[PDB]
Structures are given as structure tokens and as C-alpha cells.
Amino acid sequence: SKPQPIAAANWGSQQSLSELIDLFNSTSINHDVQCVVASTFVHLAMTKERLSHPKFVIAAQNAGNADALASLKDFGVNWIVLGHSERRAYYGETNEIVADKVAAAVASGFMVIACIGETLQERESGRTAVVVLTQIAAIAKKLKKADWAKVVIAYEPVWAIGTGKVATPQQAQEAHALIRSWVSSKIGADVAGELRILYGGSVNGKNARTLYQQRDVNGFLVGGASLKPEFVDIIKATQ
Incomplete structure (x- = not known):
């Protein structure tokens, strides 16, 4: 059977976000699912002060240095989302770097959402399987078996x-x-x-169910639509 699903909001005005958190907080979730609200650093005090929902957690994005990592820890942040797939594609960030990152956070005890995937160009040229495999491997290279307990994979x-x-x-x-x-x-x-492998990219409340019905999909990583109320539709789709 499928491991516990995850629905991540990948993060506007404080006001708007607050109305979201209000919306979230008021939601009834009748199943085992783990919700996460990834956001920039600056919004951490707030989300953390407002988010009340038992099934929700907060996480930061792209946290690097040993130091950052310490303060997040010391701030009550336990989750991270590393958008490798985008960094790689736009800025040419190496697979070597996201791997030291996962490794480092995992060691600090964080839960890690590692974002991996291929570019349009690789997709076309039938270079997908290679690219992807290559990404997961670099990651693998730095983790002990037990480390996988803190790892989530996001195909994006x-x-x-x-x-x-x-x-x-x-x-x-x-x-x-x-x-x-x-x-x-x-x-x-x-x-x-027992691994959670999430889908990311253009997920919506209209499209989510069918993506989840798929055997190896364990949830989503949500940007855009995670800023709309429709995100709830997506949480509910995880059953």
C-alpha cells in the first residue's frame, strides 16, 4: 500500500497568506496526510504564529549553511524544501551541491523535500531517465540507509x-x-x-486526483494553486 501522503504548499501579502492560513485552520481533514507550508524565511514568524492545524507543518526553502540550519532549528523549523530541479535548470547548480545539502540537513535532523527533475530540452531528446537517475544517485551517494527516513522525493x-x-x-x-x-x-x-515520491509542476485541484490515482504518486508539491483556496481540494485529493 502507499505510505502516508504529503501535500506541500510551496510559497504574497501577509493579509492574503493570513486569509489562507485561516482557511487552512478551519479545514476538516478526515485522513492521514501530512500537510506542509514551505515559505521564505521572512514569513516564518507569522506562519508559525498563525498556523494551527494539527496536520500541518511548516518548512523553509533552500536553507544552506550550517548556521542557517542551526537557527531554523532553534526557531522551531523542522522541514525543508530544496528546489534543485529549478536551480539546476536556470543557474546550472550541480547535483553535487544539493546532495551535500540534503546530507547536511538530514544530519541536523530535518525532514527534507528534495526537488528533482529534467528540463524541456532533456525531455525532448529522450534524456529524462538518465538525468533523473543521475540526480537521485548523487543524493544517494551521501546518505546512510537510515537517513532515508527523513527524505522525500519530489519529481518536478x-x-x-x-x-x-x-x-x-x-x-x-x-x-x-x-x-x-x-x-x-x-x-x-x-x-x-516507504518512500514518498511527490509530483510537482502545474498541479491543481482540477487535475490532482487522477495524478494521485497513479500507483507511485504519493502526493504533491504545490506552488501556484497553493495560493488559492483550491489547495484544499488538493489536500483532499490525497485519498
Whole structure:
């Protein structure tokens, strides 16, 4: 069966966010699911002061240095989201760097959402499987078996990010499927079966269910629509 799903909001005005948090807080969630609200640093005091929902957690984005990591810890932040797939694509950030990162946070005890995926160009040239595998491997290279307990994987192809071009459930299932097998084989079928692999890129409340019905999809990583109330529709889709 599927491990516990995750629905992450990947973060406007304080006002607007507050109305969201109000909305969230008021929501009834009748299932085991873990909600997360990733945001820039600056919004941490607030979200943390307002978010009340038992099923929700807060997390930061892209936290690096040993120091950052310490204060987040010392601020009550326990989760992180590393948007590698985008950094790689726009700025040419290496797979080596996100790996030291995961490694480092994992060691500090954070829960880590690592974002991986391919560019339009790789997608076209049939370079997907390679690119992706290569990304997960670099990561793998720095973790001990037990470290996987704190790791979440987010399949987020550059091309579906803020485009409105959402992978089909097929494409999604396929990459999710590909990542899982690599883990299974190279790490363990235990690790694998308990791994959460989330889909990210143009997810919406209209499209979410079908993506979730897919066998290797365990939830979503939500940008845009996580700023609308429709995000709730997406939380509910995780059943």
C-alpha cells in the first residue's frame, strides 16, 4: 500500500497568506496526510504564529549553511524544501551541491523535500531517465540507509513549473516508477516501499486526483494553486 501522503504548499501579502492560513485552520481533514507550508524565511514568524492545524507543518526553502540550519532549528523549523530541479535548470547548480545539502540537513535532523527533475530540452531528446537517475544517485551517494527516513522525493520537471503544462498521469507514474526501482535495487525494497515520491509542476485541484490515482504518486508539491483556496481540494485529493 502507499505510505502516508504529503501535500506541500510551496510559497504574497501577509493579509492574503493570513486569509489562507485561516482557511487552512478551519479545514476538516478526515485522513492521514501530512500537510506542509514551505515559505521564505521572512514569513516564518507569522506562519508559525498563525498556523494551527494539527496536520500541518511548516518548512523553509533552500536553507544552506550550517548556521542557517542551526537557527531554523532553534526557531522551531523542522522541514525543508530544496528546489534543485529549478536551480539546476536556470543557474546550472550541480547535483553535487544539493546532495551535500540534503546530507547536511538530514544530519541536523530535518525532514527534507528534495526537488528533482529534467528540463524541456532533456525531455525532448529522450534524456529524462538518465538525468533523473543521475540526480537521485548523487543524493544517494551521501546518505546512510537510515537517513532515508527523513527524505522525500519530489519529481518536478522544469517544464511543468508554472506553465500550465502538467505532466500526464502517465509521464508522472513513469518517472515515479523509474525512481522507485532505482531505490529498490540500489538501497533496499524496504526503503523504497516507504518512500514518498511527490509530483510537482502545474498541479491543481482540477487535475490532482487522477495524478494521485497513479500507483507511485504519493502526493504533491504545490506552488501556484497553493495560493488559492483550491489547495484544499488538493489536500483532499490525497485519498
